[PDB]
Amino acid sequence: AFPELLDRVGGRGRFQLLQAVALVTPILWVTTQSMLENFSAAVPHHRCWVPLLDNSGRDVLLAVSIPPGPDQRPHQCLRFRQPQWQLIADTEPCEDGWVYDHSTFRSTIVTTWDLVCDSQALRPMAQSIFLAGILVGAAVCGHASDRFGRRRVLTWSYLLVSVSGTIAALMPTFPLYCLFRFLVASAVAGVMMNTASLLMEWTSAQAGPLMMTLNALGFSFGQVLTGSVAYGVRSWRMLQLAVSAPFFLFFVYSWWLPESARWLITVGRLDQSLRELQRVAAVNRRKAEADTLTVEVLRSAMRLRTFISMLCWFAFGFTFFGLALDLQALGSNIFLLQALIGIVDLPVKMGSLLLLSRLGRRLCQASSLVLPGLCILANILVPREMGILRSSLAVLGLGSLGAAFTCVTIFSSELFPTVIRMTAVGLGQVAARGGAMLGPLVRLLGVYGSWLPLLVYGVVPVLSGLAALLLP
Ligand SMILES: O=C(O)CSc1nnc(Br)n1-c1ccc(C2CC2)c2ccccc12
Numbered sequence: 001a002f003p004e005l006l007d008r009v010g011g012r013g014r015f016q017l018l019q020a021v022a023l024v025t026p027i028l029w030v031t032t033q034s035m036l037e038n039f040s041a042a043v044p045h046h047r048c049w050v051p052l053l054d055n056s057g058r059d060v061l062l063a064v065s066i067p068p069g070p071d072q073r074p075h076q077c078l079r080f081r082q083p084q085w086q087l088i089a090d091t092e093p094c095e096d097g098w099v100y101d102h103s104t105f106r107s108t109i110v111t112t113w114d115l116v117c118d119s120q121a122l123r124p125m126a127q128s129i130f131l132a133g134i135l136v137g138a139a140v141c142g143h144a145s146d147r148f149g150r151r152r153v154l155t156w157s158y159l160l161v162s163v164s165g166t167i168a169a170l171m172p173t174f175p176l177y178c179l180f181r182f183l184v185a186s187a188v189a190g191v192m193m194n195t196a197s198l199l200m201e202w203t204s205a206q207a208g209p210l211m212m213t214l215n216a217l218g219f220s221f222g223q224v225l226t227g228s229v230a231y232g233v234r235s236w237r238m239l240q241l242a243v244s245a246p247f248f249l250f251f252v253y254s255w256w257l258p259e260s261a262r263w264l265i266t267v268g269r270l271d272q273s274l275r276e277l278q279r280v281a282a283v284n285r286r287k288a289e290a291d292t293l294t295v296e297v298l299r300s301a302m303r304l305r306t307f308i309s310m311l312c313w314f315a316f317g318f319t320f321f322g323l324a325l326d327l328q329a330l331g332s333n334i335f336l337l338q339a340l341i342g343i344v345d346l347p348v349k350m351g352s353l354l355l356l357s358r359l360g361r362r363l364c365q366a367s368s369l370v371l372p373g374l375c376i377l378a379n380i381l382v383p384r385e386m387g388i389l390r391s392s393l394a395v396l397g398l399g400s401l402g403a404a405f406t407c408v409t410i411f412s413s414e415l416f417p418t419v420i421r422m423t424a425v426g427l428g429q430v431a432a433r434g435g436a437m438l439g440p441l442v443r444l445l446g447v448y449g450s451w452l453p454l455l456v457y458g459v460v461p462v463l464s465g466l467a468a469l470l471l472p
Contacts, residue, residue, distance in 0.1 A: 002262050006204050008292060009277050010284040014260035016203055018283070020211075022257060023195045024218045026158070027249050030188050031222030032229060032243045033165070037127055038327050039226070040236040041109045046081040046116050049096040067091060076466050077117045081142025093117075106234045122174065124440045127325050129178050130185045131436040138433055141193055150201065154183040154194040156252040160187040165244025169237050183242075186206030189433075201260040209410045227339035242329055265302045270295060282295065305415040306424065308468055312408050313428040316466040317435030319457050320401045321377065322442055330379075330398070331391035344399035349406050361411065362471060368407045369465025372400035377458030380451050401461070435453055 010016065037165045050065045062074060064083050069075040076098075078091040099110050110116060115123045145153045161184060168180035192215070199211045258280055264273035274293060281290040323330065327337050356364040375397040382390045407429070413421045443453055 001297070002265070003204050003303065005261075005277070005293075005298070006202075008289045009281050010286050011204060011371070013205060013284040013286065015280050015283040019202060019257060020199065020214060022253070023199060024214055026191070026247070027215060027218035028225050029243060029246055030192060031219045032226045033161075033184060033188060034130075034224050035325065035338060036230075036239060036243065037224065037325055038338065039105070039108075039230040040113075040239055041123060041126065042105055042328060042334070043104075043110050043116065044105060044108070045101040046076050046098040047074055048077070048094040049099050050079060052083060054099060055434050063087065102380035104234075108236055109177070109387070112236070112304070115174075121444055126174075126178055126181070126439050126441045127440045130181050131321065131433065131439060133182035133185030134189045135430075135433045136182075136436055137189035138193055138429070140186065141190035145194060146263075147260055150194060150198055150263050151257065151354040154191060154198065155222055155251060155254045157190040157194065158189045158247050158254055161191065162244055162247035164253060165240055165247065169240035169244070183453055198260060201262055212409055213406065216409065217346060220345045220402065223342040224339040227335050227337070230338075231335045232430075238368060239435065265298060268302070270298050270302065271296060305471065308471060309408065309412060309415065309424060309428055310431045311464045312365070312369065312404065312412075313432040313434040315373075315461045316401060316404050316408075317432040318439050318442070319376070319461050320371070320398065322439040323454075323457050325396075325440055326443060330394035331387060337391075337395065340395050341399055341402070344395055345402040348396075349403040352400075352403050353407060353411075357411065362468065364407055365412060366465055368400070368404045369461050369468070372397050372404070373458050373461030373465060375400065376454065377462065378459075380454055 011239060025406045048066060052065050053061050063078050064085065064087055066074045067078055067080065077094065081090050081092050098116060099116060105111075107124075110123065110233075141153065141157075150300055164180050164183045164187060168177060169182060171177045171180065196212065196215055199215070200207055203211055229242065230239065233242050259272075261273055261276055261280070264270075264276065277293060281287050317444065320380065324341075327334055331337065349374065352368070356367055375393050379390060379393045379397065383392065384390065408424065413425050413428075416424065442456055445453055
């Protein structure tokens with residue numbers, strides 16, 4: 001009887017739009033917390049400290065103390081025991097600290113904790129930890145909202161994000177920074193899950209698509225904000241503070257939004273449900289049918305396809321969250337990137353969807369994985385002088401993976417007995433959040449050659465997409 005009550009109280013109108021506006025400004029700043037590791041953990045050019053240079057012909061002094069490296073650069077991990085003045089065999093690891101290049105970034109976490117050379121694996125692990133935190137928090141919060149309400153959990157998760165972010169920028173050692181970020185990730189996962197549930201709960205008939213696409217396009221405008229606030233704030237201790245502070249301001253105003261009116265009925269909190277419904281009626285201005293509500297009415301109210309879908313989400317997480325958290329290897333000008341991604345994404349997603357869906361439902365699913373995977377794979381062959389070509393195939397490569405998110409959120413999930421779709425979209429997101437933890441771990445394989453990470457990162461989407469043609 002709840003849909004009839006919702007029709008009696010509103011639908012579309014004013015409040016159902018104010019609520020949407022009030023819970024999407026925070027989803028731009030959840031994508032400034034996830035992809036900040038391209039600007040707060042960026043490896044600059046690091047050389048070895050020398051007593052000759054850098055105080056107790058600059059070019060000759062640099063050439064005599066540091067042996068030449070393989071990639072046409074001074075060595076980043078070794079120095080000469082004694083100035084080899086024979087240069088008009090014996091090398092010792094750096095023992096006086098590195099010297100970094102401060103020309104685009106002032107202080108990253110790499111600069112402050114020396115996560116270079118031998119201690120290199122720790123950098124692709126500080127992201128897998130965060131994704132594991134998101135995975136854990138998206139599973140714990142599921143069993144903590146059906147008993148504590150759907151609005152209180154969001155309000156407290158805002159405060160948790162704010163406090164954990166404001167604390168994580170003031171730690172003196174790596175292990176604690178790898179734990180407070182875990183807490184931030186769990187709270188962020190809770191925020192996203194509850195925002196989606198609240199967005200759908202209050203809306204009927206006009207929500208099947210529109211509502212769950214508004215969360216996914218808040219991410220695309222969020223990237224453009226990461227680029228901008230990093231063009232501006234350049235340090236790393238003043239970036240986490242500036243990103244985590246707005247969540248406290250969101251927490252204060254989050255005390256006025258009404259709670260879900262469908263959860264209040266199944267628990268017996270009829271009186272407050274009535275208060276919430278009448279309050280919503282006044283904002284919606286449809287104060288004509290609301291006189292009907294007199295407690296009693298609310299008292300009466302109180303396999304192959306499945307496997308194909310999971311593989312598709314796994315491939316989005318593995319490839320996107322591994323190749324996008326190192327946009328320093330897909331080209332240059334990191335600030336210009338992370339902003340063209342969303343601007344490409346929205347026109348690309350809309351235009352690709354409109355044209356391809358007319359071919360068929362399976363064709364759109366197939367062409368949204370093989371195309372970006374092949375675009376990424378065809379990036380190795382390009383020589384490192386057509387930057388427009390190497391960067392363009394990267395921008396368009398990563399942007400087109402963002403249309404797989406949409407073409408498997410609404411257009412798909414019908415490939416089942418078709419009762420209701422909130423059965424398997426949930427199980428799909430478990431895979432995508434678990435392929436992201438098994439994500440940047442592939443980037444640990446930069447040794448044994450450097451082409452292999454990109455090769456795997458392009459092959460996996462291609463095989464996953466080509467397996468979708470085997471539906472029967
Ligand atoms: O929880 C989920 O949404 C399922 S996978 C996941 N886990 N953490 C995050 Br953030 N994401 C994310 C899932 C999907 C997107 C699509 C391209 C627009 C994201 C874009 C930017 C940052 C994170 C994203």
